[PDB]
């Protein structure tokens, strides 16, 4: 175990490597293409 | 998760500012929304793109190689340059961090040993190979029946992310042993394998799944299928025998139609 | 208004036909930081003496030409100081400016795309395993005039694609949006301007052996000469390093 | 011992699965992550770029980059110019970013963004009908016809390009992403609103387009996308 | 869980609004219970109906389909078309929303792969076709002994439910090649399977659970034994042979008796 | 590790257990559940609607 | 895991999808049927 | 019993893993630990100490 | 975790006490970094040594015996001096204090006992031997299919550590016997081997992991290949065969080069 | 089970040799060697 109407986030082998897929989503836009303009 | 925009109400609009013309010159995409063309009604809208994120979209753990024991032993270099549609969607990007866990599908039986040997050493050549004595070389034993082998190698870059592409060489300006590409850039090591016992079949399947992805620079998906690893090369040379000698085809797969305006 | 102006210290461009700038990645060019920092040693930062505006030859733009490129920093390994910090120093790092400029006449018709694409692994020619040799990804100013697609293309000595409907890399010319890109448009503008940042996974590297960028224009509509007698039309490229660094002085690696 | 059982996919090897598996080096360190410009979190982003649609694809005109191009001149009559049937696994589409993003996935929804760019030279003039057929309709064969669904209408000067949304009109919720008739699209076309008018007789102009998805765009059902094939060992 | 009502008393009744009359016609069934009829008891009734709840009802896991390895290889076009006794049951309503959980029994040894084809895109037609290798389409290895593979399919509508009846088509009047009913309507996918042993038996057996149902429109159970799949033809033609060659037999569940009131 | 042990049916595959199994295509996003008039949770209210008995049924 | 004298209803798996047989009943009526009426 | 799963990798022997197994020889009591002198914790610090580089090499 | 420390700025210095300068006599290394040397700048280092701690690098599970069963018989005395490759990694220090736990790798099948002999005592010297009945020697019984045999064994020291290397004798003076080394210091036992079935291959793999190491005086690397086990001879005697006896081999590893200064 | 936004270290064989590796680092330094002086 490592860390914690409930949730539990629990890794097994002790290492960040070892988890599974990273679910956890906030960086985004599509601005830096589509719109990659100074003004 | 992040829900796609509702489509919000608009009527019938006179405006001085049109939002339909635009330049395609600036180097931008169009913001034009059904809302700046029609009359729209506001829309409740709760579809999601979470299965297109770069973590779902890459982490289906693919097929990266197949190598045969051939005197009960086997060998293969870690890469994903051997599988076209794997290799296809690493290289919509042109650096890619990730971690990856190996699962290895084998249909042998008995009891199989796979060494990872760290890029810089030599690893075993055959089987009985004093070199399957290790006592740093990470290795994995373990009996086809009943489970199959997984492990995690975490990111081994020499840099903060794997090159897909890369532009230069290994070595200086003269040198005419000169590598371009990114084989010189990393080397993932390679997984050595052999049989303690016989038993089943000589099969042995190398799965991939890359996981904690970073991904960098969007590329134009491949056009064309690989002819070689690590290349880039599309021109396909089919045969050597005779006078089709030195015909190439490029292998795309733009289709076309009888007629523009007609289709 | 579309007037624009861009002093780069002891260089001035100014263009009054012009669309916005492409800021690459929406990312400026930055002097590498201590967090992301590798050597140990304090790096040297030319400024004004190697940031400024190189501008190369000019190539013809005709009818039945398929396009051009050039590799940076390659492009400027022979322009000023610039140049010269690339071969006494191991590493380094920088951003450019690139200013594309073809103006014809209003009775002239044609298309540019001018891409900037990072890590640009061109394709050899064609045939067997060949890495494409180092001599035909260097040259320099230059560039490489693309020629074009044919099974009568010379496939001796390492030599790179020629096709730019495959972006020489073998995917589509027309996703080649994807990168930070412009059209020049002669019936639109006569020129274009994209600053990329410095843009690897690695905090500087050699100048000389890797090619970061790559400048591309393609003729995506071929030049129509209208009314007029002239057929062709220069096209120059001038570009400036932006925030230019250098790390561990050494002897030239020049001959 | 504490009493368990295992159900049925307990032993399985699922390709698609989320698990955690024992990190062979242990206490190996990653090399530092610095900043790269360009971080790209979601494939969707990629689709919502422009990029050109090879309109021109024809038996002569494939391989080359007048595949992307089409001529327009001066007609006493209007035209159908060019049609765009909507699918995602069309030529037409599968080839630009947006349809060879939404090749990997089994069905989509949402709104298209086509733009058209005409190049010609600067006294060149021109209206144009972009009409869209909405879904279950005919091609229409005549711009009585084609004005009767979601169209613009294009002023050509002094701005290069134009853009007419495909707007999502669907029966169901999603669209195949390969063509069927149950989920079919409809049809984009191009036509004359009045003429291209070049200053001089013979004039003769060129139209380019490009796609991107709109931001309500959505795809699901990840697959193997049609668009690479391995017929050899890469060696 | 939801107990039925308990039996109130009634005593002797005299009334002048009879429970007991009304109409047939109106389109409403019988509000009577034995409080109107007979002189009743208070009967503490604790019977439930949870076992005939739509989860429970549709929930048991049938067999959908059998399929059996030829050359080590199978394939499988999801649904439940194919199998009588569970067509039934879903065809006691219109439309259905539910995941599903798909077990494969097999009979087989060694080692199987099953792939999960998404519409839209060509299956493997073959062990060792090369399109078993795939980067994005969802597979599953498991090795027979020791236990039987397991999914869950979420659903895949393109429509809020899956029609079990369409009276439309998916072409226009005057196409030639119109197909009637919920065929076009959606789509599962397929399963493949290929073998990468010899090993054991060649019989797949795919069992599939609905879970989540939703069901919306009570329908009149099937009266006939299903003749195609995907039809509500009940006509079922017995032989081709001869003079009895367009004969046709309904083949329903009704029994007859030798008198009305003397059963 | 923990002690465990594996009582008589925990390897079974009966038809009508009730269990979790891992979700093939993850990330999928179901069709939206609009309002479908009709819904029946209950197949006792099919038993509870009036219908014909073919009291008739003869040769 | 996932969620919550007592009890614990326990996601293995992560999603809504992935898991059994919903138990929770309340919607419920005979009477759009039996009795399908205006007045 | 409780619903379990086995991933891959759980019936593996990893030669680089880190898990807990049966003490044989249970109820063993060590030899005292005393003070010795040179105490390393890290492989590091013998590659932080100087040594001579063969710098003559040759034939 | 440590990380390493980072990289300070440094100007341009004229200094008076020169920290390049030192004497290589006083038995002391050079503290000199970067910032004494050249001008530097501030880099941020989050590099760690955690892979190079006693822990990690001696804690991989090395393979420190092999043994065949003869007649379904094996028998090994448990020692680290068989392999060189563990062996030239626990002699970086003279002391080690360790637990080890202790796989059994063997490609046999059906019924196995291992036998933990503690000194002292005699060991059952074949398969059938009556001292495979034992009540207080500690045995393991394991099915090599499903599962690999593990156990920790403590600390056994009759000290506080291992001697790696002993300068000592057991015996005193005048005794003919004495051994020298660190083979009479201690003994960790040996293991007994048989198979209570025929079944598969005779192979048996010892693979042991130390675990909560304490080591002590740091050692030159063994800088040339072992010759036999408990002795630090490294003359090498490649044949007895003929004129080349009384030649001995040292086997180094120091390679030589054309020049000086042409490197 | 032996002892103890969280972690759990749980030794289910109850013997302290038992337990993995020991990840619990504290003591070091370099000067035992490097600089071994008097003064």
Same mark, same amino acid.
């Given at each position: 175990?490592?860390?914690?109407?409930?949730?539990?986030?629990?890794?097994?082998?002790?290492?960040?490597?070892?988890?599974?897929?990273?679910?956890?989503?906030?960086?985004?836009?599509?601005?830096?293409?589509?719109?990659?303009?100074?003004? | 998760?992040?829900?796609?925009?509702?489509?919000?109400?608009?009527?019938?609009?006179?405006?001085?500012?049109?939002?339909?013309?635009?330049?395609? %010159?600036?180097?931008?995409?169009?913001?034009?929304?059904?809302?700046?063309?029609?009359?729209?009604?506001?829309?409740?809208?709760?579809?999601?793109?979470?299965?297109?994120?770069?973590?779902?979209?890459?982490?289906?753990?693919?097929?990266?190689?197949?190598?045969?024991?051939?005197?009960?032993?086997?060998?293969?270099?870690?890469?994903?340059?051997?599988?076209?549609?794997?290799?296809?969607?690493?290289?919509?990007?042109?650096?890619?961090?990730?971690?990856? %866990?190996?699962?290895?599908?084998?249909?042998?039986?008995?009891?199989?040993?796979?060494?990872?040997?760290?890029?810089?050493?030599?690893?075993?050549?055959?089987?009985?190979?004093?070199?399957?004595?290790?006592?740093?070389?990470?290795?994995?034993?373990?009996?086809?029946?009943?489970?199959?082998?997984?492990?995690?190698?975490?990111?081994?870059?020499?840099?903060?992310?794997?090159?897909?592409?890369?532009?230069?060489?290994?070595?200086?300006?003269?040198?005419?042993?000169?590598?371009?590409?990114?084989?010189?850039?990393?080397?993932?090591?390679?997984?050595?394998?052999?049989?303690?016992?016989?038993?089943?079949?000589?099969?042995?399947?190398?799965?991939?799944?890359?996981?904690?992805?970073?991904?960098?620079?969007?590329?134009?998906?491949?056009?064309?299928?690989?002819?070689?690893?690590?290349?880039?090369?599309?021109?396909?040379?089919?045969?050597?025998?005779?006078?089709? %000698?030195?015909?190439?085809?490029?292998?795309?797969?733009?289709?076309?139609?009888?007629?523009?305006?007609?289709? | 208004?579309?007037?624009?102006?861009?002093?780069?210290?002891?260089?001035?461009?100014?263009?009054?036909?012009?669309?916005?700038?492409?800021?690459?990645?929406?990312?400026?060019?930055?002097?590498?930081?201590?967090?992301?920092?590798?050597?140990?040693?304090?790096?040297?930062?030319?400024?004004?003496?190697?940031?400024?505006?190189?501008?190369?030859?000019?190539?013809?733009?005709?009818?039945?030409?398929?396009?051009?490129?050039?590799?940076?920093?390659?492009?400027?390994?022979?322009?000023?100081?610039?140049?010269?910090?690339?071969?006494?120093?191991?590493?380094?790092?920088?951003?450019?400016?690139?200013?594309?400029?073809?103006?014809?006449?209003?009775?002239?018709?044609?298309?540019?795309?001018?891409?900037?694409?990072?890590?640009?692994?061109?394709?050899?020619?064609?045939?067997?395993?060949?890495?494409?040799?180092?001599?035909?990804?260097?040259?320099?100013?230059?560039?490489?005039?693309?020629?074009?697609?044919?099974?009568?293309?010379?496939?001796?000595?390492?030599?790179?694609?020629?096709?730019?409907?495959?972006?020489?890399?073998?995917?589509?010319?027309?996703?080649?949006?994807?990168?930070?890109?412009?059209?020049?448009?002669?019936?639109?503008?006569?020129?274009?301007?994209?600053?990329?940042?410095?843009?690897?996974?690695?905090?500087?590297?050699?100048?000389?052996?890797?090619?970061?960028?790559?400048?591309?224009?393609?003729?995506?509509?071929?030049?129509?000469?209208?009314?007029?007698?002239?057929?062709?039309?220069?096209?120059?490229?001038?570009?400036?390093?932006?925030?230019?660094?250098?790390?561990?002085?050494?002897?030239?690696?020049?001959? | 011992?504490?009493?368990?059982?295992?159900?049925?996919?307990?032993?399985?090897?699922?390709?698609?699965?989320?698990?955690?598996?024992?990190?062979?080096?242990?206490?190996?360190?990653?090399?530092?992550?610095?900043?790269?410009?360009?971080?790209?979190?979601?494939?969707?982003?990629?689709?919502?770029?422009?990029?050109?649609?090879?309109?021109?694809?024809?038996?002569?005109?494939?391989?080359?980059?007048?595949?992307?191009?089409?001529?327009?001149?001066?007609?006493?009559?209007?035209?159908?110019?060019?049609?765009?049937?909507?699918?995602?696994?069309?030529?037409?589409?599968?080839?630009?970013?947006?349809?060879?993003?939404?090749?990997?996935?089994?069905?989509?929804?949402?709104?298209?963004?086509?733009?058209?760019?005409?190049?010609?030279?600067?006294?060149?003039?021109?209206?144009?009908?972009?009409?869209?057929?909405?879904?279950?309709?005919?091609?229409?064969?005549?711009?009585?016809?084609?004005?009767?669904?979601?169209?613009?209408?294009?002023?050509?000067?002094?701005?290069?390009?134009?853009?007419?949304?495909?707007?999502?009109?669907?029966?169901?919720?999603?669209?195949?992403?390969?063509?069927?008739?149950?989920?079919?699209?409809?049809?984009?076309?191009?036509?004359?609103?009045?003429?291209?008018?070049?200053?001089?007789?013979?004039?003769?102009?060129?139209?380019?387009?490009?796609?991107?998805?709109?931001?309500?765009?959505?795809?699901?059902?990840?697959?193997?996308?049609?668009?690479?094939?391995?017929?050899?060992?890469?060696?």
């Amino acid at each position: 175990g490592a860390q914690v109407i409930k949730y539990f986030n629990i890794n097994y082998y002790k290492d960040s490597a070892s988890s599974g897929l990273s679910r956890q989503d906030f960086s985004q836009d599509p601005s830096k293409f589509t719109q990659p303009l100074v003004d | 998760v992040l829900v796609v925009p509702d489509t919000k109400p608009s009527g019938p609009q006179h405006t001085t500012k049109p939002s339909i013309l635009g330049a395609m %010159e600036i180097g931008a995409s169009s913001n034009a929304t059904p809302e700046s063309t029609i009359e729209t009604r506001y829309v409740y809208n709760t579809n999601t793109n979470a299965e297109a994120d770069v973590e779902m979209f890459l982490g289906r753990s693919a097929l990266w190689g197949k190598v045969t024991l051939t005197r009960q032993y086997a060998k293969w270099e870690i890469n994903f340059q051997e599988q076209a549609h794997i290799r296809k969607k690493f290289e919509f990007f042109t650096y890619l961090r990730f971690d990856m %866990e190996v699962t290895i599908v084998t249909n042998n039986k008995g009891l199989m040993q796979i060494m990872f040997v760290p890029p810089g050493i030599d690893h075993p050549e055959t089987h009985d190979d004093r070199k399957w004595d290790s006592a740093s070389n990470p290795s994995v034993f373990f009996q086809p029946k009943s489970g199959f082998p997984r492990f995690t190698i975490p990111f081994t870059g020499l840099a903060s992310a794997y090159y897909m592409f890369y532009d230069g060489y290994d070595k200086p300006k003269g040198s005419d042993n000169n590598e371009y590409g990114i084989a010189p850039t990393n080397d993932m090591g390679l997984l050595c394998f052999r049989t303690l016992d016989n038993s089943g079949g000589n099969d042995v399947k190398i799965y991939v799944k890359p996981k904690h992805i970073t991904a960098w620079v969007p590329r134009p998906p491949r056009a064309t299928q690989y002819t070689h690893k690590y290349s880039t090369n599309y021109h396909y040379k089919p045969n050597s025998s005779g006078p089709d %000698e030195h015909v190439l085809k490029d292998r795309h797969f733009i289709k076309t139609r009888p007629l523009i305006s007609s289709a | 208004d579309r007037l624009k102006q861009i002093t780069i210290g002891n260089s001035t461009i100014t263009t009054q036909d012009s669309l916005h700038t492409v800021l690459a990645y929406g990312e400026w060019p930055t002097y590498l930081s201590d967090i992301d920092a590798t050597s140990v040693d304090k790096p040297t930062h030319p400024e004004t003496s190697a940031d400024r505006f190189y501008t190369l030859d000019s190539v013809e733009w005709q009818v039945g030409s398929h396009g051009w490129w050039w590799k940076l920093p390659d492009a400027l390994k022979d322009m000023g100081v610039f140049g010269q910090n690339m071969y006494y120093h191991s590493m380094g790092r920088s951003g450019f400016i690139i200013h594309t400029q073809c103006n014809a006449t209003k009775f002239h018709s044609g298309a540019l795309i001018v891409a900037v694409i990072p890590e640009h692994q061109l394709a050899y020619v064609g045939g067997v395993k060949v890495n494409v040799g180092y001599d035909h990804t260097h040259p320099g100013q230059s560039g490489h005039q693309i020629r074009g697609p044919s099974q009568s293309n010379d496939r001796s000595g390492g030599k790179p694609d020629e096709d730019p409907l495959f972006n020489c890399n073998g995917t589509l010319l027309g996703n080649i949006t994807i990168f930070p890109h412009q059209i020049i448009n002669l019936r639109t503008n006569n020129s274009s301007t994209i600053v990329v940042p410095y843009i690897n996974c690695v905090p500087m590297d050699n100048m000389l052996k890797h090619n970061n960028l790559s400048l591309v224009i393609i003729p995506l509509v071929p030049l129509r000469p209208g009314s007029s007698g002239i057929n062709s039309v220069p096209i120059t490229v001038t570009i400036a390093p932006y925030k230019s660094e250098f790390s561990g002085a050494m002897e030239a690696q020049r001959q | 011992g504490l009493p368990t059982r295992l159900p049925s996919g307990s032993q399985q090897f699922m390709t698609t699965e989320d698990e955690q598996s024992p990190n062979i080096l242990p206490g190996f360190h990653p090399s530092k992550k610095i900043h790269i410009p360009g971080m790209i979190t979601n494939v969707m982003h990629m689709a919502r770029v422009d990029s050109f649609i090879p309109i021109n694809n024809i038996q002569g005109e494939v391989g080359k980059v007048s595949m992307y191009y089409i001529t327009v001149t001066k007609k006493t009559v209007t035209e159908r110019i060019l049609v765009l049937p909507l699918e995602m696994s069309n030529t037409l589409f599968a080839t630009t970013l947006l349809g060879e993003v939404l090749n990997y996935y089994a069905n989509w929804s949402g709104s298209i963004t086509i733009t058209f760019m005409c190049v010609c030279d600067a006294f060149s003039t021109g209206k144009f009908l972009v009409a869209y057929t909405p879904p279950g309709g005919k091609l229409p064969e005549d711009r009585k016809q084609a004005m009767l669904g979601v169209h613009i209408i294009w002023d050509l000067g002094l701005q290069s390009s134009c853009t007419i949304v495909v707007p999502w009109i669907s029966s169901g919720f999603y669209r195949r992403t390969k063509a069927d008739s149950f989920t079919h699209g409809g049809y984009v076309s191009l036509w004359y609103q009045t003429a291209f008018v070049p200053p001089v007789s013979g004039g003769t102009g060129s139209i380019l387009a490009t796609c991107s998805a709109c931001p309500d765009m959505s795809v699901r059902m990840l697959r193997d996308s049609p668009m690479m094939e391995q017929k050899n060992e890469l060696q």
